[PDB]
Amino acid sequence: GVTNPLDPEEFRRQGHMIIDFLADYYRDVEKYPVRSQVEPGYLRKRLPETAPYNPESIETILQDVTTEIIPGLTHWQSPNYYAYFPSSGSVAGFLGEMLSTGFNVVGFNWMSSPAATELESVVMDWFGKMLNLPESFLFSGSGGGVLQGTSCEAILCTLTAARDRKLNKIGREHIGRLVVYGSDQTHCALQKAAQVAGINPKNFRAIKTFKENSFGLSAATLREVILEDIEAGLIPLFVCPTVGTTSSTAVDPISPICEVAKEYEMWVHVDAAYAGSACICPEFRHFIDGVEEADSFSLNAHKWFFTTLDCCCLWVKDPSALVKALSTNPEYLRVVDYKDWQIALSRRFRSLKLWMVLRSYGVTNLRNFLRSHVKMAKTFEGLICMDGRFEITVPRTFAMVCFRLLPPENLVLANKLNQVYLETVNATGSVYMTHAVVGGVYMIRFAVGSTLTEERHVIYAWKILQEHADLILGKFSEADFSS
Amino acid sequence: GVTNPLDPEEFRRQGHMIIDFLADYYRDVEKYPVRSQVEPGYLRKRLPETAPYNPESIETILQDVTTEIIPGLTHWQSPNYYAYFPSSGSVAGFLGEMLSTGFNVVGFNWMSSPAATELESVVMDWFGKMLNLPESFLFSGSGGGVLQGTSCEAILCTLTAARDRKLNKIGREHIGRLVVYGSDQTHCALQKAAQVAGINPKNFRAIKTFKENSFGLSAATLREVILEDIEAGLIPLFVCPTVGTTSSTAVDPISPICEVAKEYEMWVHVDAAYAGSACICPEFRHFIDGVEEADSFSLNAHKWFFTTLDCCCLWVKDPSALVKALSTNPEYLRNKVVDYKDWQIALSRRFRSLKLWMVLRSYGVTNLRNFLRSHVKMAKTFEGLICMDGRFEITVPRTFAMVCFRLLPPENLVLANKLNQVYLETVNATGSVYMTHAVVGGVYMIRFAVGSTLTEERHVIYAWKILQEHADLILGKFSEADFSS
């Protein structure tokens, strides 16, 4: 009569069906245009306006996924996807999420599933030791790590913990004097966290960075701004140095910044959402030097660690600061209770993803995975440098190369040349790159991180960039870009 | 040579293994004790202290899942799980997450995956119309809906939107005077949202409720507290009436609450995290009457709508109020294609619309209505068995598929509370069933929440049998001195 929506045999049959559907997708993803070519509003036209009253077959639904959903996808998993930062995935990460979705437990507390809490603390110590984090960040020592969804939520929680730590000493009425510090390259997640956490919009600082420092935040500039804020009656609270900025993969020097922060009793959060995973490699560990003097450190394992979206790894020195700000149990009372470390109460079993990746691939293969991305980007950088019509705009640090086509007021023309040039390349659907404007310079970003990407795809992307460079420069007139 | 971590054939091979592993789990879940019986710290001692340098096989990991992970699980998917609220799942919803994790796109904006944005707006209109929400909550009309992870996140976003709307008019310096209003039964997600949003802790209100009103918030009591706050120089900002409270599934009357809230220009968010999905059935739609006068409305589709953890559904009359607070564009550009990241906290959004789309299509409105109805019937059946046993008592009216009850002794309250605490823990310790409790109005009561998808009538009857046999056991050897401590 009525089949249970979780019937084991129907789960088995349809599950095998979708596995085959997805394996075919990874096999054929290259045939699709990378950036979706549908028009806004395409899907509402093709779909009914109301839910169906009677059930539809999984066979019919899967066909609609092929005809209606897949065209409206920008294929982050395409090997020719080089936009933004990678949606780094893997078989192991996918299986860990499906085991998490299969068990479907709610990690509201330890008792709700003890493994969903204890496995998280183990793998965060695993990951932290591979990162060579100090014992002050590990359960092994005096710290701790927590898995979250995104970096914005992680930054939000460390910010409220920093806010509550200061306001509980000086009074809640001073919230309108707290200043949050970033660079003009810091990701929009910091400003959003400050807006949600009640920081005054006029008290967010995006400190100017300079080409002479490759747009990394100078501690000398940070101290100048703090003294200005202190003279204006404000209270410096929070600074967020970034390793691997999203625009140009700039790197803020953590140790000089923390030195300035301790003088003014400021919380330091190190944002390494993308590049942090590379410090698993000994030759890249120097990029987070000085993290031992910071209060919190975060990276997105879904960006450059194969887990699949989403898995944010947050290490803190003082988890009590998170609990004091995020727990709802009375202030006096304020086993691990992870819900008091983050926003989400109905936590997902995210540690399975990280556990699967670490076990299925091991430290050695994971290092070489990240190294292969960096090496393919180093090759792309070498190909650019051998073509005198191009220019590397900032030093490459982690697997992303920023470059621009040069023209054969001059900056505005060059910027327009690269916007048109990039746009014709993306319009082919053969590859996908995004851009950034750093120091007034419109530059193209080539971020090699898609798991399916091999050297032949990077070389193929170089061929298309060269062919389109031949096209635009061959018929170049500066009046065509002087508008 | 090393194989690509996303190799299609290896994905196919290992994927089929997990599907078989999970199907075996659903087939055999009844054999495990529902509440995990491990000791704290068991896992750290069975697992290595460092990550392995060399790869391990999926067959080895899977065996470790069986011997190390599964024992440390409390099986929310067990048909004998009646604790808290359900972790409502289904085949269709699991497959939606599978396709979402398989495509693994990032819904940062419309261009990053147009389908990941447009499908969400379609299905939210689908669900909203199934809930008979007014057009002011739909994209067809004046409003819109957004999919988030959890209701606390959804309440936080809605609260900061209400905060910014007020503070943009009167000035940011008045944040220390804003007051957030809830009942003493309101879920702690509201208080957590107020703590994050910068609301002063002494300006959070947990207004007292009374057994005479089944612990629903009285609009007259709410108006009394507001006048006290106004007379004390405070600014009432935000009230969150609940349909289906967590402890006793109480329901707050929405219409008179917004009437009070309209008088003092307050934002109203209707929290229906658990019970909200039931109102797609016309005979339960009356429970959210008055939502036409609220500003926002939320339910957890992972709680009672089969998606899977997690899927929170938030409808708002004015999405621009969310954009004004959550956008990082400068304030003059927010002051004017959907960009869902500005409706919520998450920037790197997940393709959550697949889950909801899959559930709605694979089962349809009629079958989905009957799924929820069957849970209510089974709970009403459980309620009937309780009344026929004179040793038990129903403590609050049953509203949506959760029954509150307690064992009665042969103050009396302290002894009765201690009796039910011992009684409940002895039942949960068997591992045959799992139910949690709540102290409402000074009364310790046991909660029986029928929502796990695999739960059938035989499981509810089985749980009633377990409760009766323990009742016979506790009361057969009853002595007042055994509980008067």
Short mmCIF file of all heavy atoms in Angstrom, two decimals, chain A residues 41 43-45 47-51 69, chain B residues 110 113-129 137-141 143-147 314-315 319 337-341 343 349 351-354 356-357 360:
data_model
loop_
_atom_site.label_atom_id
_atom_site.label_comp_id
_atom_site.label_asym_id
_atom_site.label_seq_id
_atom_site.Cartn_x
_atom_site.Cartn_y
_atom_site.Cartn_z
N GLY A 41 15.83 33.71 -14.83
CA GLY A 41 14.43 33.36 -14.94
C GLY A 41 14.14 32.16 -15.81
O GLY A 41 12.96 31.90 -16.10
N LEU A 43 14.45 28.94 -15.16
CA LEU A 43 13.94 27.74 -14.50
C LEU A 43 12.48 27.88 -14.11
O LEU A 43 11.72 26.90 -14.19
CB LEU A 43 14.80 27.43 -13.27
CG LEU A 43 14.60 26.03 -12.68
CD1 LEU A 43 14.81 24.96 -13.74
CD2 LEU A 43 15.54 25.81 -11.50
N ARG A 44 12.06 29.07 -13.68
CA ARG A 44 10.66 29.26 -13.32
C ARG A 44 9.74 29.06 -14.52
O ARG A 44 8.61 28.59 -14.36
CB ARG A 44 10.45 30.66 -12.72
CG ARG A 44 9.12 30.83 -12.00
CD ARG A 44 9.04 32.18 -11.30
NE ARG A 44 9.73 32.18 -10.02
CZ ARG A 44 9.19 31.77 -8.87
NH1 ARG A 44 7.94 31.33 -8.85
NH2 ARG A 44 9.89 31.81 -7.75
N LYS A 45 10.21 29.41 -15.72
CA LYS A 45 9.43 29.15 -16.92
C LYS A 45 9.24 27.66 -17.15
O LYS A 45 8.14 27.21 -17.49
CB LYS A 45 10.10 29.79 -18.14
CG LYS A 45 10.23 31.30 -18.09
CD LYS A 45 10.99 31.81 -19.31
CE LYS A 45 11.34 33.28 -19.18
NZ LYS A 45 12.81 33.51 -19.18
N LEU A 47 9.47 25.11 -15.00
CA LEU A 47 8.91 24.30 -13.93
C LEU A 47 7.47 24.71 -13.64
O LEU A 47 7.08 25.85 -13.89
CB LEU A 47 9.74 24.43 -12.64
CG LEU A 47 11.19 23.94 -12.68
CD1 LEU A 47 11.77 23.92 -11.28
CD2 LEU A 47 11.29 22.57 -13.33
N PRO A 48 6.65 23.79 -13.12
CA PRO A 48 5.29 24.17 -12.70
C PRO A 48 5.31 25.15 -11.54
O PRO A 48 6.31 25.29 -10.82
CB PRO A 48 4.66 22.83 -12.29
CG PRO A 48 5.81 21.90 -12.08
CD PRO A 48 6.88 22.34 -13.03
N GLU A 49 4.18 25.83 -11.36
CA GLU A 49 4.04 26.86 -10.34
C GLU A 49 3.69 26.31 -8.96
O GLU A 49 3.82 27.03 -7.97
CB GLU A 49 2.98 27.88 -10.76
CG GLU A 49 3.52 29.02 -11.61
CD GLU A 49 2.54 29.44 -12.70
OE1 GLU A 49 1.34 29.12 -12.57
OE2 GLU A 49 2.99 30.08 -13.67
N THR A 50 3.24 25.06 -8.88
CA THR A 50 2.85 24.45 -7.61
C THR A 50 3.48 23.07 -7.49
O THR A 50 3.89 22.46 -8.48
CB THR A 50 1.33 24.34 -7.47
OG1 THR A 50 0.80 23.57 -8.56
CG2 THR A 50 0.68 25.72 -7.47
N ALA A 51 3.53 22.57 -6.26
CA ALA A 51 4.02 21.23 -6.02
C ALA A 51 3.03 20.20 -6.57
O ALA A 51 1.82 20.45 -6.58
CB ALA A 51 4.25 20.99 -4.53
N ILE A 69 18.24 21.25 -14.60
CA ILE A 69 19.16 21.69 -13.55
C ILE A 69 20.58 21.83 -14.08
O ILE A 69 21.23 22.86 -13.88
CB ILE A 69 19.11 20.72 -12.35
CG1 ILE A 69 17.68 20.61 -11.81
CG2 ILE A 69 20.07 21.16 -11.26
CD1 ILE A 69 17.12 21.93 -11.32
N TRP B 110 24.15 34.25 -8.13
CA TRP B 110 23.36 33.61 -9.17
C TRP B 110 24.25 32.98 -10.23
O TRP B 110 24.00 31.85 -10.68
CB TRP B 110 22.41 34.62 -9.80
CG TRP B 110 21.61 34.08 -10.96
CD1 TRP B 110 20.37 33.51 -10.90
CD2 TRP B 110 21.99 34.07 -12.34
NE1 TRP B 110 19.96 33.14 -12.16
CE2 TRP B 110 20.94 33.47 -13.06
CE3 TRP B 110 23.12 34.51 -13.04
CZ2 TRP B 110 20.98 33.30 -14.44
CZ3 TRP B 110 23.16 34.34 -14.41
CH2 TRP B 110 22.10 33.74 -15.10
N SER B 113 25.95 29.32 -9.65
CA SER B 113 25.11 28.26 -10.20
C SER B 113 23.67 28.75 -10.32
O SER B 113 22.93 28.70 -9.34
CB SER B 113 25.18 26.99 -9.35
OG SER B 113 26.31 26.21 -9.73
N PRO B 114 23.25 29.25 -11.49
CA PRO B 114 21.88 29.78 -11.61
C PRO B 114 20.80 28.85 -11.08
O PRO B 114 19.83 29.32 -10.47
CB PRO B 114 21.73 30.02 -13.12
CG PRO B 114 23.11 30.31 -13.58
CD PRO B 114 24.02 29.45 -12.73
N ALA B 115 20.94 27.54 -11.29
CA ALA B 115 19.93 26.60 -10.80
C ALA B 115 19.90 26.58 -9.28
O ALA B 115 18.82 26.43 -8.68
CB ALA B 115 20.20 25.21 -11.36
N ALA B 116 21.05 26.73 -8.64
CA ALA B 116 21.11 26.69 -7.18
C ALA B 116 20.39 27.86 -6.53
O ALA B 116 20.05 27.78 -5.34
CB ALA B 116 22.57 26.65 -6.71
N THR B 117 20.15 28.94 -7.27
CA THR B 117 19.38 30.07 -6.78
C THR B 117 17.93 30.02 -7.21
O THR B 117 17.02 30.21 -6.39
CB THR B 117 20.02 31.39 -7.25
OG1 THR B 117 21.26 31.59 -6.56
CG2 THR B 117 19.10 32.57 -6.98
N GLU B 118 17.68 29.75 -8.50
CA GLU B 118 16.32 29.81 -9.02
C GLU B 118 15.46 28.65 -8.54
O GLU B 118 14.25 28.83 -8.33
CB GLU B 118 16.35 29.86 -10.55
CG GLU B 118 17.06 31.08 -11.10
CD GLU B 118 16.75 31.34 -12.56
OE1 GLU B 118 15.89 30.63 -13.12
OE2 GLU B 118 17.36 32.26 -13.15
N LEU B 119 16.04 27.47 -8.34
CA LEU B 119 15.26 26.35 -7.81
C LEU B 119 14.81 26.62 -6.38
O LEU B 119 13.71 26.21 -5.99
CB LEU B 119 16.06 25.05 -7.88
CG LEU B 119 15.33 23.80 -7.38
CD1 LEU B 119 14.15 23.47 -8.28
CD2 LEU B 119 16.28 22.62 -7.26
N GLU B 120 15.64 27.31 -5.59
CA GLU B 120 15.27 27.64 -4.22
C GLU B 120 14.05 28.56 -4.19
O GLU B 120 13.13 28.35 -3.40
CB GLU B 120 16.45 28.29 -3.51
CG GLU B 120 16.26 28.49 -2.01
CD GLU B 120 17.56 28.76 -1.29
OE1 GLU B 120 18.59 28.15 -1.66
OE2 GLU B 120 17.57 29.59 -0.36
N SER B 121 14.04 29.58 -5.05
CA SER B 121 12.90 30.49 -5.10
C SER B 121 11.63 29.79 -5.57
O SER B 121 10.53 30.16 -5.15
CB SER B 121 13.21 31.68 -6.01
OG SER B 121 14.34 32.39 -5.53
N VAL B 122 11.77 28.77 -6.42
CA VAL B 122 10.59 28.04 -6.90
C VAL B 122 10.02 27.17 -5.78
O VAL B 122 8.82 27.22 -5.49
CB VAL B 122 10.95 27.21 -8.14
CG1 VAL B 122 9.82 26.24 -8.46
CG2 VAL B 122 11.22 28.12 -9.33
N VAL B 123 10.87 26.36 -5.14
CA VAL B 123 10.38 25.41 -4.15
C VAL B 123 9.87 26.12 -2.90
O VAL B 123 8.94 25.64 -2.25
CB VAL B 123 11.45 24.36 -3.81
CG1 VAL B 123 11.79 23.52 -5.04
CG2 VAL B 123 12.70 25.02 -3.24
N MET B 124 10.47 27.26 -2.55
CA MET B 124 9.96 28.02 -1.42
C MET B 124 8.56 28.56 -1.71
O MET B 124 7.72 28.63 -0.81
CB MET B 124 10.91 29.16 -1.06
CG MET B 124 12.15 28.72 -0.29
SD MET B 124 11.76 27.89 1.26
CE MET B 124 11.52 29.29 2.35
N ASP B 125 8.31 28.93 -2.97
CA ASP B 125 6.95 29.29 -3.36
C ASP B 125 6.04 28.07 -3.34
O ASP B 125 4.86 28.18 -2.95
CB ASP B 125 6.96 29.93 -4.75
CG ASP B 125 7.26 31.42 -4.71
OD1 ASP B 125 7.47 31.95 -3.60
OD2 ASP B 125 7.29 32.05 -5.79
N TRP B 126 6.55 26.91 -3.75
CA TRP B 126 5.79 25.67 -3.65
C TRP B 126 5.38 25.40 -2.20
O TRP B 126 4.19 25.24 -1.90
CB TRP B 126 6.62 24.50 -4.18
CG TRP B 126 6.70 24.39 -5.67
CD1 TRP B 126 6.36 25.34 -6.59
CD2 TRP B 126 7.16 23.26 -6.41
NE1 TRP B 126 6.58 24.87 -7.86
CE2 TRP B 126 7.07 23.59 -7.78
CE3 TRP B 126 7.63 21.99 -6.05
CZ2 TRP B 126 7.44 22.70 -8.79
CZ3 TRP B 126 8.00 21.11 -7.06
CH2 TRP B 126 7.90 21.47 -8.41
N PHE B 127 6.37 25.35 -1.30
CA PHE B 127 6.09 25.04 0.10
C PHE B 127 5.20 26.09 0.74
O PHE B 127 4.29 25.76 1.51
CB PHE B 127 7.41 24.91 0.86
CG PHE B 127 7.34 24.04 2.08
CD1 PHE B 127 8.47 23.78 2.83
CD2 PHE B 127 6.14 23.48 2.48
CE1 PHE B 127 8.42 22.98 3.95
CE2 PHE B 127 6.07 22.68 3.61
CZ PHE B 127 7.21 22.43 4.35
N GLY B 128 5.46 27.37 0.44
CA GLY B 128 4.64 28.43 1.02
C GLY B 128 3.18 28.32 0.62
O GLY B 128 2.28 28.56 1.43
N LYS B 129 2.92 27.94 -0.64
CA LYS B 129 1.54 27.78 -1.08
C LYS B 129 0.91 26.53 -0.49
O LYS B 129 -0.30 26.52 -0.21
CB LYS B 129 1.49 27.74 -2.61
CG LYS B 129 1.81 29.08 -3.26
CD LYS B 129 1.19 29.19 -4.64
CE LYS B 129 2.22 28.89 -5.72
NZ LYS B 129 2.84 30.13 -6.26
N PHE B 137 4.37 36.69 1.49
CA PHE B 137 5.55 35.90 1.81
C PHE B 137 6.15 35.22 0.59
O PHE B 137 7.19 34.56 0.72
CB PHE B 137 5.22 34.84 2.87
CG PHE B 137 5.01 35.40 4.25
CD1 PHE B 137 3.74 35.47 4.80
CD2 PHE B 137 6.08 35.84 5.00
CE1 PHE B 137 3.54 35.97 6.07
CE2 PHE B 137 5.89 36.35 6.27
CZ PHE B 137 4.62 36.41 6.81
N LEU B 138 5.53 35.35 -0.57
CA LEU B 138 5.92 34.61 -1.76
C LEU B 138 6.54 35.54 -2.80
O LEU B 138 6.30 36.75 -2.80
CB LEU B 138 4.72 33.88 -2.37
CG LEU B 138 3.89 33.02 -1.42
CD1 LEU B 138 2.66 32.47 -2.13
CD2 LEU B 138 4.73 31.90 -0.84
N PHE B 139 7.34 34.94 -3.69
CA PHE B 139 7.88 35.70 -4.81
C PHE B 139 6.79 36.10 -5.79
O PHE B 139 6.92 37.13 -6.47
CB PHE B 139 8.97 34.88 -5.52
CG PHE B 139 10.23 34.75 -4.72
CD1 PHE B 139 10.52 33.57 -4.05
CD2 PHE B 139 11.13 35.79 -4.65
CE1 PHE B 139 11.68 33.44 -3.31
CE2 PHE B 139 12.30 35.67 -3.92
CZ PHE B 139 12.57 34.49 -3.25
N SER B 140 5.72 35.31 -5.89
CA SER B 140 4.57 35.72 -6.68
C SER B 140 3.98 37.03 -6.17
O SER B 140 3.49 37.84 -6.97
CB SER B 140 3.50 34.62 -6.66
OG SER B 140 4.04 33.37 -7.06
N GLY B 141 4.03 37.25 -4.86
CA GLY B 141 3.53 38.48 -4.29
C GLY B 141 4.63 39.45 -3.90
O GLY B 141 5.48 39.80 -4.72
N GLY B 143 6.83 39.21 -1.03
CA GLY B 143 7.96 38.76 -0.24
C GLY B 143 8.87 37.75 -0.91
O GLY B 143 9.15 37.84 -2.11
N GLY B 144 9.36 36.79 -0.13
CA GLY B 144 10.26 35.78 -0.65
C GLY B 144 10.66 34.83 0.46
O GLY B 144 10.44 35.09 1.65
N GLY B 145 11.27 33.72 0.05
CA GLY B 145 11.73 32.72 0.98
C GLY B 145 13.16 32.32 0.68
O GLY B 145 13.63 32.39 -0.46
N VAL B 146 13.86 31.90 1.73
CA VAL B 146 15.27 31.53 1.63
C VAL B 146 15.49 30.25 2.44
O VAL B 146 14.87 30.05 3.48
CB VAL B 146 16.19 32.67 2.13
CG1 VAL B 146 15.85 33.05 3.56
CG2 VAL B 146 17.66 32.28 2.00
N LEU B 147 16.37 29.39 1.93
CA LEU B 147 16.75 28.16 2.61
C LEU B 147 18.04 28.38 3.39
O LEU B 147 19.04 28.84 2.82
CB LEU B 147 16.92 27.01 1.61
CG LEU B 147 15.65 26.44 1.00
CD1 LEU B 147 15.98 25.32 0.03
CD2 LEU B 147 14.72 25.94 2.09
N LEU B 314 12.79 29.77 5.67
CA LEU B 314 12.46 31.08 6.22
C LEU B 314 11.73 31.90 5.16
O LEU B 314 12.27 32.12 4.07
CB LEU B 314 13.71 31.81 6.69
CG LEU B 314 13.52 33.29 7.03
CD1 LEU B 314 12.80 33.44 8.36
CD2 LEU B 314 14.86 34.03 7.05
N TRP B 315 10.52 32.34 5.48
CA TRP B 315 9.77 33.27 4.64
C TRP B 315 9.73 34.63 5.32
O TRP B 315 9.56 34.72 6.54
CB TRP B 315 8.34 32.77 4.39
CG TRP B 315 8.24 31.55 3.53
CD1 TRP B 315 8.06 31.51 2.18
CD2 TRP B 315 8.28 30.19 3.97
NE1 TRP B 315 8.01 30.21 1.74
CE2 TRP B 315 8.14 29.38 2.82
CE3 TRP B 315 8.44 29.57 5.21
CZ2 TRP B 315 8.15 27.99 2.89
CZ3 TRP B 315 8.45 28.19 5.28
CH2 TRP B 315 8.30 27.41 4.12
N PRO B 319 12.23 41.00 2.13
CA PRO B 319 13.62 40.54 2.01
C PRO B 319 14.64 41.67 1.98
O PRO B 319 15.81 41.44 2.32
CB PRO B 319 13.63 39.76 0.68
CG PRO B 319 12.37 40.17 -0.03
CD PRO B 319 11.38 40.50 1.03
N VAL B 337 17.48 39.53 -10.25
CA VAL B 337 18.26 38.36 -9.89
C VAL B 337 18.49 38.32 -8.38
O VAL B 337 18.99 39.27 -7.79
CB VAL B 337 19.60 38.33 -10.66
CG1 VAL B 337 20.65 37.57 -9.88
CG2 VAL B 337 19.40 37.72 -12.04
N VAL B 338 18.11 37.20 -7.76
CA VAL B 338 18.22 37.06 -6.32
C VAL B 338 19.67 36.82 -5.92
O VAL B 338 20.40 36.07 -6.59
CB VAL B 338 17.31 35.92 -5.82
CG1 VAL B 338 17.53 35.65 -4.34
CG2 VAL B 338 15.85 36.25 -6.09
N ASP B 339 20.09 37.47 -4.84
CA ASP B 339 21.42 37.28 -4.25
C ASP B 339 21.20 36.76 -2.83
O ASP B 339 21.13 37.54 -1.88
CB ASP B 339 22.22 38.58 -4.27
CG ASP B 339 23.71 38.35 -4.24
OD1 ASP B 339 24.13 37.17 -4.20
OD2 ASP B 339 24.47 39.34 -4.25
N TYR B 340 21.11 35.44 -2.69
CA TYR B 340 20.65 34.83 -1.45
C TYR B 340 21.64 34.99 -0.30
O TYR B 340 21.24 34.90 0.86
CB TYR B 340 20.34 33.35 -1.67
CG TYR B 340 18.89 33.07 -1.96
CD1 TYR B 340 18.53 32.24 -3.02
CD2 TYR B 340 17.88 33.62 -1.19
CE1 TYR B 340 17.20 31.97 -3.29
CE2 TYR B 340 16.55 33.37 -1.45
CZ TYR B 340 16.21 32.54 -2.50
OH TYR B 340 14.89 32.28 -2.77
N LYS B 341 22.93 35.20 -0.60
CA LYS B 341 23.91 35.36 0.48
C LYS B 341 23.59 36.56 1.35
O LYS B 341 23.96 36.58 2.53
CB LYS B 341 25.32 35.48 -0.11
CG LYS B 341 25.49 36.62 -1.10
CD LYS B 341 26.94 37.05 -1.21
CE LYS B 341 27.12 38.11 -2.27
NZ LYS B 341 26.95 37.56 -3.65
N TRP B 343 20.63 37.31 2.27
CA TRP B 343 19.46 36.95 3.06
C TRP B 343 19.82 36.14 4.30
O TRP B 343 18.93 35.83 5.10
CB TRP B 343 18.45 36.15 2.23
CG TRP B 343 17.94 36.80 0.97
CD1 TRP B 343 18.63 37.59 0.10
CD2 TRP B 343 16.61 36.69 0.44
NE1 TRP B 343 17.82 37.99 -0.93
CE2 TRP B 343 16.57 37.45 -0.75
CE3 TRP B 343 15.45 36.03 0.86
CZ2 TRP B 343 15.41 37.57 -1.52
CZ3 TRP B 343 14.30 36.15 0.09
CH2 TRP B 343 14.30 36.91 -1.09
N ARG B 349 27.04 29.28 -0.18
CA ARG B 349 25.79 28.57 0.06
C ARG B 349 25.82 27.18 -0.55
O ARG B 349 26.45 26.94 -1.59
CB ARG B 349 24.62 29.36 -0.52
CG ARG B 349 24.27 30.63 0.24
CD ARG B 349 23.24 31.46 -0.50
NE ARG B 349 22.46 30.67 -1.45
CZ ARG B 349 21.32 30.06 -1.16
NH1 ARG B 349 20.81 30.15 0.06
NH2 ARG B 349 20.68 29.36 -2.10
N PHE B 351 23.69 23.85 -2.17
CA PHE B 351 22.56 23.61 -3.07
C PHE B 351 21.47 22.85 -2.31
O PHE B 351 21.15 21.69 -2.59
CB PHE B 351 23.04 22.84 -4.30
CG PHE B 351 22.13 22.96 -5.50
CD1 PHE B 351 22.61 22.64 -6.76
CD2 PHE B 351 20.81 23.36 -5.38
CE1 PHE B 351 21.80 22.73 -7.87
CE2 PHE B 351 19.99 23.45 -6.49
CZ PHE B 351 20.49 23.13 -7.74
N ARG B 352 20.88 23.54 -1.33
CA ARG B 352 19.90 22.91 -0.45
C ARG B 352 18.53 22.73 -1.11
O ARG B 352 17.74 21.91 -0.63
CB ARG B 352 19.73 23.73 0.83
CG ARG B 352 20.74 23.39 1.91
CD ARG B 352 20.29 23.92 3.27
NE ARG B 352 21.32 23.74 4.28
CZ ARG B 352 22.33 24.58 4.48
NH1 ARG B 352 22.45 25.66 3.73
NH2 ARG B 352 23.22 24.33 5.43
N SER B 353 18.24 23.46 -2.19
CA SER B 353 16.93 23.36 -2.82
C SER B 353 16.69 21.99 -3.44
O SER B 353 15.53 21.63 -3.66
CB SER B 353 16.77 24.44 -3.89
OG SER B 353 17.99 24.68 -4.58
N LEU B 354 17.74 21.23 -3.71
CA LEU B 354 17.57 19.90 -4.29
C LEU B 354 16.82 18.98 -3.32
O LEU B 354 15.88 18.28 -3.72
CB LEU B 354 18.92 19.30 -4.67
CG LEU B 354 19.50 19.80 -5.99
CD1 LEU B 354 20.84 19.13 -6.29
CD2 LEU B 354 18.52 19.58 -7.13
N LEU B 356 14.66 19.70 -0.85
CA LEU B 356 13.24 20.04 -0.78
C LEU B 356 12.53 19.72 -2.08
O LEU B 356 11.40 19.20 -2.07
CB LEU B 356 13.10 21.52 -0.43
CG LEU B 356 11.72 22.03 0.00
CD1 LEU B 356 11.15 21.18 1.12
CD2 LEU B 356 11.82 23.49 0.43
N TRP B 357 13.16 20.03 -3.21
CA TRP B 357 12.59 19.70 -4.51
C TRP B 357 12.36 18.20 -4.65
O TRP B 357 11.30 17.76 -5.10
CB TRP B 357 13.51 20.21 -5.62
CG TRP B 357 12.92 20.21 -7.00
CD1 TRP B 357 11.71 20.69 -7.37
CD2 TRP B 357 13.55 19.72 -8.19
NE1 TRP B 357 11.52 20.52 -8.72
CE2 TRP B 357 12.64 19.92 -9.25
CE3 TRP B 357 14.78 19.11 -8.46
CZ2 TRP B 357 12.93 19.55 -10.56
CZ3 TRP B 357 15.06 18.74 -9.76
CH2 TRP B 357 14.14 18.97 -10.80
N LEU B 360 9.39 16.97 -2.39
CA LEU B 360 8.08 17.40 -2.87
C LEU B 360 7.65 16.61 -4.10
O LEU B 360 6.48 16.25 -4.23
CB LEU B 360 8.10 18.90 -3.16
CG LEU B 360 8.26 19.81 -1.95
CD1 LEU B 360 8.53 21.25 -2.38
CD2 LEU B 360 7.04 19.73 -1.05
#
